[PDB]
Amino acid sequence: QPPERRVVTVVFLGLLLDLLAFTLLLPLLPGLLESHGRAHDPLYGSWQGGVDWFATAIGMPVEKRYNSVLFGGLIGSAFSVLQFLCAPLTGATSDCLGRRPVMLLCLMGVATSYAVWATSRSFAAFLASRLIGGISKGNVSLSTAIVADLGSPLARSQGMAVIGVAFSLGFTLGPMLGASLPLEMAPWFALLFAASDLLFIFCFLPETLPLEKRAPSIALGFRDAADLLSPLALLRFSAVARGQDPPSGDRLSSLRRLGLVYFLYLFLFSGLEYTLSFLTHQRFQFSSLQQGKMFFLIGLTMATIQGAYARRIHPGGEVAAVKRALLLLVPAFLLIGWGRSLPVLGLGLLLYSFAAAVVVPCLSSVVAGYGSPGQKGTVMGTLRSLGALARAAGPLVAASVYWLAGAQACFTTWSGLFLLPFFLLQ
Ligand SMILES: CCCCCCCC/C=C\CCCCCCCC(=O)OC[C@H](O)CO
């Protein structure tokens, strides 16, 4: 096929190898925390002390699986703070040095993250592994940047859809494999996928930013440092607005508006998506195995919609499809929030899947069309960073309201707040 097919193919297979490696360990995390608690790990005990303080503050009942999910949520949140910190820098660096050298630095970091975990099963090794993997998770935003390097709006909108399929397939099949593996072998499979991704990208990712299109600098002074690290400067896209041939006027307002909608969407969606672990236990007494089955079906529907519908939306129709998805999430979360049987829960999950499939891909696709050739890493790095900030705060704030106000209070209120990104877009 053309050179555009070849790059997206390499980006997709690389990213799927990456996401299998990460998601593989997620169904095992409950057992690994429980092991540390049971060995009296005094560092574990520190963090358990923090989760406890939080559990007391929000009024969360004392129960093994409620603790497991809350601890997994603090851990998930700390990790997203690392992704937020590093995504703009990694982007700006690649704008200046090319996509391939920075993609490869990031993958050596991810491979090293799994080398560490492989060697030691302590809470310390766990956090050391998460820290390194966290600061090296720019490979994700570099994938979106590489798609944004492509020539046509069509190339880009389909590229972002294909990345959507990677995340949906990765988050589906990874935990499936992990729970099928003997625990000893799991960190070895993560390593195999992470080393495979590194080697695959080394041999097959073509460069999509030529030397004569690159940003002259990463950051010259403290104001440029702050442009990559301040949540408000990342919302205002100040790093992009201060680059070579940047967007200005109406074009720069639009970029900011898509970013605010992106952040708000993911703040709300990531919160309800996390607290669905509370709702399916508390209301329907789902085992974590049954939560496995449910997220599996969600991921498969999402990959189908992403591959089949999201990927076929005519360039120019991204925004119309996002507005329709944000409206669909109002009934979707009302049905989940209030449903007292599996048919009603099921209907809300189906709408959840159709709507979530479209939003991240369609918005990335429109955002990717902004910035000059040497700013694609800074634009998509800034977008990923806003998502990371959103997935950092979303779970914690939804957990507070879920336990302080109850499932209905949280799911009704978050449902209402979806009209904020809907109206910001219209
Ligand atoms: C380019 C970089 C190359 C790679 C550089 C590697 C750096 C990794 C450093 C520290 C993490 C290792 C932590 C090892 C944990 C030691 C064991 C421990 O903490 O105690 C065991 C626990 O009490 C019960 O098993």
Side-chain angles (χ1 to χ4, degrees), residues 291-292 294-340:
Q291 279 164 0
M294 182 191 83
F295 278 120
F296 182 84
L297 276 194
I298 285 170
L300 277 199
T301 307
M302 277 185 50
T304 301
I305 302 317
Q306 280 169 328
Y309 173 82
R311 193 177 61 82
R312 295 199 167 95
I313 295 169
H314 196 279
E318 275 79 47
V319 170
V322 174
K323 280 171 300 198
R324 270 192 319 273
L326 294 168
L327 283 186
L328 208 53
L329 289 178
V330 172
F333 283 120
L334 284 182
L335 286 163
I336 286 150
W338 293 95
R340 306 211 60 74

mmCIF file of all heavy atoms in Angstrom, residues 291-340, unseen atoms left out:
data_model
loop_
_atom_site.group_PDB
_atom_site.id
_atom_site.type_symbol
_atom_site.label_atom_id
_atom_site.label_comp_id
_atom_site.label_asym_id
_atom_site.label_seq_id
_atom_site.Cartn_x
_atom_site.Cartn_y
_atom_site.Cartn_z
ATOM 1 N N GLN A 291 -16.672 -8.721 36.146
ATOM 2 C CA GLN A 291 -16.231 -7.366 35.705
ATOM 3 C C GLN A 291 -15.240 -7.509 34.542
ATOM 4 O O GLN A 291 -15.343 -6.731 33.591
ATOM 5 C CB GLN A 291 -15.656 -6.558 36.864
ATOM 6 C CG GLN A 291 -16.752 -5.921 37.704
ATOM 7 C CD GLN A 291 -16.289 -5.443 39.061
ATOM 8 O OE1 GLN A 291 -15.122 -5.579 39.419
ATOM 9 N NE2 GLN A 291 -17.206 -4.859 39.826
ATOM 10 N N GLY A 292 -14.334 -8.481 34.606
ATOM 11 C CA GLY A 292 -13.595 -8.987 33.436
ATOM 12 C C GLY A 292 -14.477 -9.181 32.200
ATOM 13 O O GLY A 292 -14.196 -8.513 31.189
ATOM 14 N N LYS A 293 -15.489 -10.060 32.258
ATOM 15 C CA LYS A 293 -16.389 -10.407 31.119
ATOM 16 C C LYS A 293 -17.008 -9.126 30.526
ATOM 17 O O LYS A 293 -16.907 -8.923 29.316
ATOM 18 C CB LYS A 293 -17.451 -11.410 31.578
ATOM 19 N N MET A 294 -17.568 -8.263 31.371
ATOM 20 C CA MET A 294 -18.254 -6.989 31.013
ATOM 21 C C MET A 294 -17.308 -6.040 30.247
ATOM 22 O O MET A 294 -17.680 -5.595 29.137
ATOM 23 C CB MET A 294 -18.752 -6.328 32.303
ATOM 24 C CG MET A 294 -19.501 -5.047 32.086
ATOM 25 S SD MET A 294 -19.796 -4.132 33.615
ATOM 26 C CE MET A 294 -18.235 -3.271 33.811
ATOM 27 N N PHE A 295 -16.143 -5.709 30.816
ATOM 28 C CA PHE A 295 -15.110 -4.839 30.188
ATOM 29 C C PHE A 295 -14.610 -5.488 28.891
ATOM 30 O O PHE A 295 -14.358 -4.769 27.935
ATOM 31 C CB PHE A 295 -13.980 -4.515 31.176
ATOM 32 C CG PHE A 295 -14.300 -3.380 32.126
ATOM 33 C CD1 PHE A 295 -14.317 -3.577 33.501
ATOM 34 C CD2 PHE A 295 -14.599 -2.110 31.642
ATOM 35 C CE1 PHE A 295 -14.629 -2.533 34.362
ATOM 36 C CE2 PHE A 295 -14.917 -1.067 32.504
ATOM 37 C CZ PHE A 295 -14.937 -1.282 33.863
ATOM 38 N N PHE A 296 -14.489 -6.808 28.835
ATOM 39 C CA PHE A 296 -14.162 -7.534 27.583
ATOM 40 C C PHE A 296 -15.193 -7.187 26.486
ATOM 41 O O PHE A 296 -14.787 -6.863 25.337
ATOM 42 C CB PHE A 296 -14.109 -9.048 27.813
ATOM 43 C CG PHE A 296 -13.737 -9.838 26.582
ATOM 44 C CD1 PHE A 296 -12.404 -10.016 26.226
ATOM 45 C CD2 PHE A 296 -14.714 -10.392 25.770
ATOM 46 C CE1 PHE A 296 -12.060 -10.749 25.097
ATOM 47 C CE2 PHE A 296 -14.368 -11.126 24.643
ATOM 48 C CZ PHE A 296 -13.044 -11.293 24.301
ATOM 49 N N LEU A 297 -16.490 -7.271 26.797
ATOM 50 C CA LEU A 297 -17.559 -7.057 25.785
ATOM 51 C C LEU A 297 -17.551 -5.594 25.354
ATOM 52 O O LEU A 297 -17.684 -5.334 24.140
ATOM 53 C CB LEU A 297 -18.921 -7.480 26.343
ATOM 54 C CG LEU A 297 -19.217 -8.968 26.222
ATOM 55 C CD1 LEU A 297 -20.689 -9.249 26.482
ATOM 56 C CD2 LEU A 297 -18.829 -9.497 24.846
ATOM 57 N N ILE A 298 -17.378 -4.696 26.320
ATOM 58 C CA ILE A 298 -17.276 -3.229 26.092
ATOM 59 C C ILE A 298 -16.112 -2.961 25.130
ATOM 60 O O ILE A 298 -16.325 -2.255 24.121
ATOM 61 C CB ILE A 298 -17.130 -2.470 27.426
ATOM 62 C CG1 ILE A 298 -18.458 -2.403 28.184
ATOM 63 C CG2 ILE A 298 -16.538 -1.088 27.217
ATOM 64 C CD1 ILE A 298 -18.337 -1.889 29.612
ATOM 65 N N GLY A 299 -14.926 -3.483 25.428
ATOM 66 C CA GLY A 299 -13.738 -3.290 24.584
ATOM 67 C C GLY A 299 -13.947 -3.796 23.172
ATOM 68 O O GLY A 299 -13.460 -3.130 22.253
ATOM 69 N N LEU A 300 -14.648 -4.921 22.989
ATOM 70 C CA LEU A 300 -14.900 -5.550 21.660
ATOM 71 C C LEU A 300 -15.902 -4.709 20.854
ATOM 72 O O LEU A 300 -15.700 -4.554 19.633
ATOM 73 C CB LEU A 300 -15.464 -6.960 21.841
ATOM 74 C CG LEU A 300 -14.481 -8.106 22.088
ATOM 75 C CD1 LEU A 300 -15.171 -9.424 21.780
ATOM 76 C CD2 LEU A 300 -13.199 -7.983 21.266
ATOM 77 N N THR A 301 -16.969 -4.227 21.484
ATOM 78 C CA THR A 301 -17.950 -3.339 20.820
ATOM 79 C C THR A 301 -17.213 -2.084 20.361
ATOM 80 O O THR A 301 -17.309 -1.748 19.166
ATOM 81 C CB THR A 301 -19.124 -3.057 21.755
ATOM 82 O OG1 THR A 301 -19.574 -4.347 22.164
ATOM 83 C CG2 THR A 301 -20.250 -2.282 21.113
ATOM 84 N N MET A 302 -16.437 -1.487 21.271
ATOM 85 C CA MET A 302 -15.659 -0.227 21.070
ATOM 86 C C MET A 302 -14.693 -0.365 19.882
ATOM 87 O O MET A 302 -14.688 0.532 19.029
ATOM 88 C CB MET A 302 -14.909 0.152 22.354
ATOM 89 C CG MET A 302 -15.809 0.900 23.321
ATOM 90 S SD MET A 302 -15.041 1.548 24.829
ATOM 91 C CE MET A 302 -13.610 2.406 24.169
ATOM 92 N N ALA A 303 -13.942 -1.461 19.799
ATOM 93 C CA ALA A 303 -13.040 -1.772 18.666
ATOM 94 C C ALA A 303 -13.844 -1.883 17.364
ATOM 95 O O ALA A 303 -13.362 -1.429 16.322
ATOM 96 C CB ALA A 303 -12.294 -3.050 18.933
ATOM 97 N N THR A 304 -15.034 -2.465 17.408
ATOM 98 C CA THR A 304 -15.874 -2.651 16.207
ATOM 99 C C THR A 304 -16.342 -1.279 15.725
ATOM 100 O O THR A 304 -16.173 -0.997 14.538
ATOM 101 C CB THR A 304 -17.026 -3.617 16.488
ATOM 102 O OG1 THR A 304 -16.431 -4.848 16.899
ATOM 103 C CG2 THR A 304 -17.899 -3.839 15.276
ATOM 104 N N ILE A 305 -16.888 -0.461 16.630
ATOM 105 C CA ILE A 305 -17.369 0.909 16.299
ATOM 106 C C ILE A 305 -16.187 1.734 15.782
ATOM 107 O O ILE A 305 -16.360 2.410 14.745
ATOM 108 C CB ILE A 305 -18.048 1.588 17.502
ATOM 109 C CG1 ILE A 305 -19.235 0.771 18.033
ATOM 110 C CG2 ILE A 305 -18.459 3.008 17.134
ATOM 111 C CD1 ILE A 305 -20.120 0.197 16.949
ATOM 112 N N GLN A 306 -15.033 1.659 16.461
ATOM 113 C CA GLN A 306 -13.812 2.427 16.092
ATOM 114 C C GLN A 306 -13.343 2.055 14.677
ATOM 115 O O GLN A 306 -13.216 2.974 13.840
ATOM 116 C CB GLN A 306 -12.709 2.196 17.118
ATOM 117 C CG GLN A 306 -12.905 3.045 18.354
ATOM 118 C CD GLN A 306 -11.990 2.642 19.476
ATOM 119 O OE1 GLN A 306 -11.628 1.482 19.640
ATOM 120 N NE2 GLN A 306 -11.634 3.619 20.286
ATOM 121 N N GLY A 307 -13.117 0.757 14.445
ATOM 122 C CA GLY A 307 -12.710 0.178 13.152
ATOM 123 C C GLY A 307 -13.737 0.394 12.052
ATOM 124 O O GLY A 307 -13.305 0.597 10.897
ATOM 125 N N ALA A 308 -15.037 0.316 12.366
ATOM 126 C CA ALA A 308 -16.111 0.198 11.344
ATOM 127 C C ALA A 308 -16.797 1.545 11.125
ATOM 128 O O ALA A 308 -17.044 1.880 9.948
ATOM 129 C CB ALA A 308 -17.126 -0.849 11.712
ATOM 130 N N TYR A 309 -17.101 2.289 12.190
ATOM 131 C CA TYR A 309 -17.842 3.573 12.058
ATOM 132 C C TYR A 309 -16.872 4.765 12.213
ATOM 133 O O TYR A 309 -16.687 5.468 11.211
ATOM 134 C CB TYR A 309 -19.079 3.580 12.964
ATOM 135 C CG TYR A 309 -19.797 4.906 13.029
ATOM 136 C CD1 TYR A 309 -20.698 5.304 12.048
ATOM 137 C CD2 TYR A 309 -19.544 5.778 14.078
ATOM 138 C CE1 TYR A 309 -21.339 6.531 12.125
ATOM 139 C CE2 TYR A 309 -20.169 7.008 14.164
ATOM 140 C CZ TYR A 309 -21.069 7.387 13.186
ATOM 141 O OH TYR A 309 -21.666 8.610 13.325
ATOM 142 N N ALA A 310 -16.266 4.983 13.385
ATOM 143 C CA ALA A 310 -15.321 6.099 13.656
ATOM 144 C C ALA A 310 -14.351 6.281 12.479
ATOM 145 O O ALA A 310 -14.105 7.447 12.074
ATOM 146 C CB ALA A 310 -14.552 5.876 14.937
ATOM 147 N N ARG A 311 -13.841 5.171 11.936
ATOM 148 C CA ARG A 311 -12.803 5.162 10.874
ATOM 149 C C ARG A 311 -13.391 5.627 9.546
ATOM 150 O O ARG A 311 -12.591 5.976 8.689
ATOM 151 C CB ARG A 311 -12.164 3.778 10.709
ATOM 152 C CG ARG A 311 -10.895 3.768 9.865
ATOM 153 C CD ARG A 311 -10.280 2.382 9.795
ATOM 154 N NE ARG A 311 -11.204 1.440 9.177
ATOM 155 C CZ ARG A 311 -11.371 1.296 7.872
ATOM 156 N NH1 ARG A 311 -10.660 2.026 7.031
ATOM 157 N NH2 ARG A 311 -12.267 0.441 7.405
ATOM 158 N N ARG A 312 -14.714 5.647 9.391
ATOM 159 C CA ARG A 312 -15.391 5.918 8.086
ATOM 160 C C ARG A 312 -16.141 7.264 8.122
ATOM 161 O O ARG A 312 -16.814 7.600 7.123
ATOM 162 C CB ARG A 312 -16.305 4.737 7.746
ATOM 163 C CG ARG A 312 -15.550 3.441 7.492
ATOM 164 C CD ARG A 312 -16.405 2.452 6.727
ATOM 165 N NE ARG A 312 -15.681 1.308 6.171
ATOM 166 C CZ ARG A 312 -15.558 0.110 6.745
ATOM 167 N NH1 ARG A 312 -16.074 -0.114 7.941
ATOM 168 N NH2 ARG A 312 -14.905 -0.862 6.128
ATOM 169 N N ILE A 313 -16.022 8.033 9.210
ATOM 170 C CA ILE A 313 -16.630 9.393 9.291
ATOM 171 C C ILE A 313 -15.841 10.296 8.340
ATOM 172 O O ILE A 313 -14.591 10.362 8.471
ATOM 173 C CB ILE A 313 -16.656 9.925 10.734
ATOM 174 C CG1 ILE A 313 -17.577 9.087 11.621
ATOM 175 C CG2 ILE A 313 -17.026 11.399 10.756
ATOM 176 C CD1 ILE A 313 -17.449 9.404 13.088
ATOM 177 N N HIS A 314 -16.543 10.903 7.382
ATOM 178 C CA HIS A 314 -15.972 11.815 6.357
ATOM 179 C C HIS A 314 -15.272 12.950 7.105
ATOM 180 O O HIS A 314 -15.818 13.456 8.093
ATOM 181 C CB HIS A 314 -17.064 12.270 5.373
ATOM 182 C CG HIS A 314 -16.509 12.864 4.127
ATOM 183 N ND1 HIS A 314 -16.065 14.173 4.065
ATOM 184 C CD2 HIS A 314 -16.257 12.325 2.918
ATOM 185 C CE1 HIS A 314 -15.566 14.416 2.872
ATOM 186 N NE2 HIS A 314 -15.686 13.303 2.140
ATOM 187 N N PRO A 315 -14.013 13.310 6.742
ATOM 188 C CA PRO A 315 -13.352 14.487 7.318
ATOM 189 C C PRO A 315 -14.224 15.743 7.134
ATOM 190 O O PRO A 315 -14.708 15.942 6.055
ATOM 191 C CB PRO A 315 -12.016 14.566 6.554
ATOM 192 C CG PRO A 315 -11.760 13.144 6.099
ATOM 193 C CD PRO A 315 -13.138 12.582 5.803
ATOM 194 N N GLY A 316 -14.447 16.513 8.202
ATOM 195 C CA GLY A 316 -15.470 17.573 8.242
ATOM 196 C C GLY A 316 -16.649 17.190 9.128
ATOM 197 O O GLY A 316 -17.334 18.111 9.601
ATOM 198 N N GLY A 317 -16.870 15.891 9.388
ATOM 199 C CA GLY A 317 -17.982 15.372 10.218
ATOM 200 C C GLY A 317 -17.549 14.896 11.602
ATOM 201 O O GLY A 317 -18.412 14.414 12.358
ATOM 202 N N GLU A 318 -16.268 15.045 11.948
ATOM 203 C CA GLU A 318 -15.725 14.680 13.286
ATOM 204 C C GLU A 318 -16.574 15.337 14.385
ATOM 205 O O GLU A 318 -16.984 14.625 15.349
ATOM 206 C CB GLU A 318 -14.252 15.086 13.429
ATOM 207 C CG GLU A 318 -13.255 14.069 12.872
ATOM 208 C CD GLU A 318 -13.096 14.102 11.361
ATOM 209 O OE1 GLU A 318 -12.945 15.221 10.826
ATOM 210 O OE2 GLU A 318 -13.164 13.001 10.716
ATOM 211 N N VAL A 319 -16.841 16.634 14.246
ATOM 212 C CA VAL A 319 -17.449 17.450 15.335
ATOM 213 C C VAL A 319 -18.926 17.056 15.491
ATOM 214 O O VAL A 319 -19.365 16.879 16.634
ATOM 215 C CB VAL A 319 -17.196 18.961 15.111
ATOM 216 C CG1 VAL A 319 -18.003 19.838 16.059
ATOM 217 C CG2 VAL A 319 -15.710 19.303 15.241
ATOM 218 N N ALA A 320 -19.659 16.869 14.393
ATOM 219 C CA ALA A 320 -21.077 16.427 14.408
ATOM 220 C C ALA A 320 -21.193 15.084 15.169
ATOM 221 O O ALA A 320 -22.090 14.969 16.035
ATOM 222 C CB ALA A 320 -21.606 16.351 13.003
ATOM 223 N N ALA A 321 -20.293 14.125 14.908
ATOM 224 C CA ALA A 321 -20.273 12.783 15.544
ATOM 225 C C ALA A 321 -19.950 12.904 17.045
ATOM 226 O O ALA A 321 -20.571 12.160 17.855
ATOM 227 C CB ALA A 321 -19.296 11.885 14.834
ATOM 228 N N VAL A 322 -19.053 13.818 17.443
ATOM 229 C CA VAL A 322 -18.716 13.999 18.887
ATOM 230 C C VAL A 322 -19.929 14.578 19.624
ATOM 231 O O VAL A 322 -20.237 14.107 20.721
ATOM 232 C CB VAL A 322 -17.453 14.854 19.110
ATOM 233 C CG1 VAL A 322 -17.234 15.124 20.606
ATOM 234 C CG2 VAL A 322 -16.229 14.202 18.487
ATOM 235 N N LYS A 323 -20.576 15.594 19.066
ATOM 236 C CA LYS A 323 -21.799 16.189 19.676
ATOM 237 C C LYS A 323 -22.837 15.090 19.911
ATOM 238 O O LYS A 323 -23.406 15.070 21.001
ATOM 239 C CB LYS A 323 -22.366 17.313 18.806
ATOM 240 C CG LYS A 323 -21.637 18.642 18.967
ATOM 241 C CD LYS A 323 -22.037 19.700 17.955
ATOM 242 C CE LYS A 323 -21.762 19.246 16.533
ATOM 243 N NZ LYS A 323 -21.719 20.365 15.555
ATOM 244 N N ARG A 324 -23.045 14.211 18.930
ATOM 245 C CA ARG A 324 -24.060 13.131 19.004
ATOM 246 C C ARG A 324 -23.625 12.126 20.077
ATOM 247 O O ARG A 324 -24.477 11.717 20.851
ATOM 248 C CB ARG A 324 -24.314 12.500 17.627
ATOM 249 C CG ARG A 324 -25.419 13.188 16.827
ATOM 250 C CD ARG A 324 -25.901 12.429 15.591
ATOM 251 N NE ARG A 324 -24.754 11.848 14.910
ATOM 252 C CZ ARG A 324 -24.004 12.454 13.994
ATOM 253 N NH1 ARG A 324 -24.305 13.667 13.562
ATOM 254 N NH2 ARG A 324 -22.941 11.834 13.505
ATOM 255 N N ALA A 325 -22.337 11.807 20.177
ATOM 256 C CA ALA A 325 -21.817 10.898 21.221
ATOM 257 C C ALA A 325 -21.988 11.540 22.610
ATOM 258 O O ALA A 325 -22.414 10.848 23.537
ATOM 259 C CB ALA A 325 -20.390 10.533 20.926
ATOM 260 N N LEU A 326 -21.695 12.822 22.790
ATOM 261 C CA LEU A 326 -21.863 13.451 24.130
ATOM 262 C C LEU A 326 -23.336 13.419 24.552
ATOM 263 O O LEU A 326 -23.586 13.262 25.753
ATOM 264 C CB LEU A 326 -21.308 14.878 24.122
ATOM 265 C CG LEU A 326 -19.797 14.982 23.914
ATOM 266 C CD1 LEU A 326 -19.386 16.421 23.629
ATOM 267 C CD2 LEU A 326 -19.021 14.424 25.101
ATOM 268 N N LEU A 327 -24.280 13.585 23.619
ATOM 269 C CA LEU A 327 -25.737 13.512 23.932
ATOM 270 C C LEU A 327 -26.084 12.077 24.338
ATOM 271 O O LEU A 327 -26.871 11.894 25.278
ATOM 272 C CB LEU A 327 -26.575 13.941 22.718
ATOM 273 C CG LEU A 327 -26.644 15.445 22.450
ATOM 274 C CD1 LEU A 327 -27.607 15.733 21.317
ATOM 275 C CD2 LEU A 327 -27.038 16.225 23.707
ATOM 276 N N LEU A 328 -25.509 11.095 23.649
ATOM 277 C CA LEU A 328 -25.841 9.673 23.873
ATOM 278 C C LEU A 328 -25.413 9.234 25.283
ATOM 279 O O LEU A 328 -26.056 8.327 25.837
ATOM 280 C CB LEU A 328 -25.165 8.843 22.784
ATOM 281 C CG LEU A 328 -25.879 7.535 22.451
ATOM 282 C CD1 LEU A 328 -27.351 7.792 22.125
ATOM 283 C CD2 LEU A 328 -25.167 6.818 21.305
ATOM 284 N N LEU A 329 -24.397 9.879 25.851
ATOM 285 C CA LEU A 329 -23.834 9.546 27.185
ATOM 286 C C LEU A 329 -24.755 10.021 28.314
ATOM 287 O O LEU A 329 -24.511 9.611 29.481
ATOM 288 C CB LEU A 329 -22.459 10.203 27.312
ATOM 289 C CG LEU A 329 -21.369 9.584 26.441
ATOM 290 C CD1 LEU A 329 -20.059 10.330 26.589
ATOM 291 C CD2 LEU A 329 -21.173 8.119 26.787
ATOM 292 N N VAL A 330 -25.722 10.907 28.029
ATOM 293 C CA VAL A 330 -26.652 11.418 29.077
ATOM 294 C C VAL A 330 -27.600 10.265 29.419
ATOM 295 O O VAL A 330 -27.529 9.752 30.539
ATOM 296 C CB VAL A 330 -27.322 12.753 28.677
ATOM 297 C CG1 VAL A 330 -28.418 13.168 29.651
ATOM 298 C CG2 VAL A 330 -26.294 13.888 28.517
ATOM 299 N N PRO A 331 -28.442 9.744 28.488
ATOM 300 C CA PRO A 331 -29.173 8.501 28.729
ATOM 301 C C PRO A 331 -28.291 7.287 29.097
ATOM 302 O O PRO A 331 -28.677 6.516 29.955
ATOM 303 C CB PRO A 331 -29.905 8.251 27.396
ATOM 304 C CG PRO A 331 -29.190 9.107 26.379
ATOM 305 C CD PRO A 331 -28.773 10.321 27.175
ATOM 306 N N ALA A 332 -27.130 7.119 28.467
ATOM 307 C CA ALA A 332 -26.220 5.986 28.768
ATOM 308 C C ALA A 332 -25.972 5.912 30.282
ATOM 309 O O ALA A 332 -26.219 4.849 30.854
ATOM 310 C CB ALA A 332 -24.921 6.091 27.997
ATOM 311 N N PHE A 333 -25.525 6.988 30.926
ATOM 312 C CA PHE A 333 -25.116 6.965 32.358
ATOM 313 C C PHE A 333 -26.330 7.049 33.294
ATOM 314 O O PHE A 333 -26.216 6.596 34.474
ATOM 315 C CB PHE A 333 -24.099 8.068 32.643
ATOM 316 C CG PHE A 333 -22.723 7.721 32.155
ATOM 317 C CD1 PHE A 333 -22.081 8.507 31.219
ATOM 318 C CD2 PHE A 333 -22.090 6.585 32.618
ATOM 319 C CE1 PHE A 333 -20.817 8.173 30.767
ATOM 320 C CE2 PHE A 333 -20.826 6.255 32.171
ATOM 321 C CZ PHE A 333 -20.192 7.045 31.246
ATOM 322 N N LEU A 334 -27.457 7.601 32.823
ATOM 323 C CA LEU A 334 -28.722 7.545 33.601
ATOM 324 C C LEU A 334 -29.151 6.077 33.706
ATOM 325 O O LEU A 334 -29.556 5.677 34.802
ATOM 326 C CB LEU A 334 -29.798 8.438 32.965
ATOM 327 C CG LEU A 334 -29.631 9.947 33.195
ATOM 328 C CD1 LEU A 334 -30.777 10.729 32.574
ATOM 329 C CD2 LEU A 334 -29.528 10.289 34.670
ATOM 330 N N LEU A 335 -29.009 5.295 32.631
ATOM 331 C CA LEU A 335 -29.443 3.869 32.578
ATOM 332 C C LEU A 335 -28.542 2.998 33.478
ATOM 333 O O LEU A 335 -29.074 2.092 34.195
ATOM 334 C CB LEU A 335 -29.426 3.387 31.124
ATOM 335 C CG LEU A 335 -30.564 3.923 30.249
ATOM 336 C CD1 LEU A 335 -30.247 3.750 28.759
ATOM 337 C CD2 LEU A 335 -31.898 3.267 30.603
ATOM 338 N N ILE A 336 -27.235 3.272 33.462
ATOM 339 C CA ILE A 336 -26.235 2.598 34.338
ATOM 340 C C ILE A 336 -26.487 3.007 35.795
ATOM 341 O O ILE A 336 -26.585 2.088 36.656
ATOM 342 C CB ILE A 336 -24.798 2.897 33.857
ATOM 343 C CG1 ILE A 336 -24.471 2.123 32.575
ATOM 344 C CG2 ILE A 336 -23.781 2.613 34.951
ATOM 345 C CD1 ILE A 336 -23.496 2.815 31.664
ATOM 346 N N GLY A 337 -26.612 4.315 36.054
ATOM 347 C CA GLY A 337 -26.747 4.906 37.401
ATOM 348 C C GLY A 337 -27.939 4.367 38.175
ATOM 349 O O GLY A 337 -27.765 4.123 39.401
ATOM 350 N N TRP A 338 -29.096 4.200 37.508
ATOM 351 C CA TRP A 338 -30.432 3.891 38.118
ATOM 352 C C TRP A 338 -30.909 2.446 37.853
ATOM 353 O O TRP A 338 -31.752 1.985 38.622
ATOM 354 C CB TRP A 338 -31.490 4.887 37.625
ATOM 355 C CG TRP A 338 -31.277 6.294 38.086
ATOM 356 C CD1 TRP A 338 -30.636 7.292 37.409
ATOM 357 C CD2 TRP A 338 -31.737 6.883 39.319
ATOM 358 N NE1 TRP A 338 -30.640 8.445 38.146
ATOM 359 C CE2 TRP A 338 -31.303 8.226 39.322
ATOM 360 C CE3 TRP A 338 -32.454 6.404 40.420
ATOM 361 C CZ2 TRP A 338 -31.557 9.089 40.380
ATOM 362 C CZ3 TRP A 338 -32.712 7.262 41.465
ATOM 363 C CH2 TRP A 338 -32.277 8.590 41.438
ATOM 364 N N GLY A 339 -30.421 1.773 36.800
ATOM 365 C CA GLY A 339 -30.813 0.402 36.396
ATOM 366 C C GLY A 339 -30.640 -0.625 37.507
ATOM 367 O O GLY A 339 -29.539 -0.681 38.104
ATOM 368 N N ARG A 340 -31.695 -1.415 37.753
ATOM 369 C CA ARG A 340 -31.807 -2.394 38.870
ATOM 370 C C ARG A 340 -31.847 -3.838 38.327
ATOM 371 O O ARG A 340 -31.980 -4.783 39.149
ATOM 372 C CB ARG A 340 -33.001 -2.002 39.746
ATOM 373 C CG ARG A 340 -32.926 -0.554 40.221
ATOM 374 C CD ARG A 340 -33.543 -0.256 41.581
ATOM 375 N NE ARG A 340 -32.918 -1.022 42.655
ATOM 376 C CZ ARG A 340 -31.715 -0.789 43.183
ATOM 377 N NH1 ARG A 340 -30.956 0.217 42.773
ATOM 378 N NH2 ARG A 340 -31.272 -1.575 44.144
#
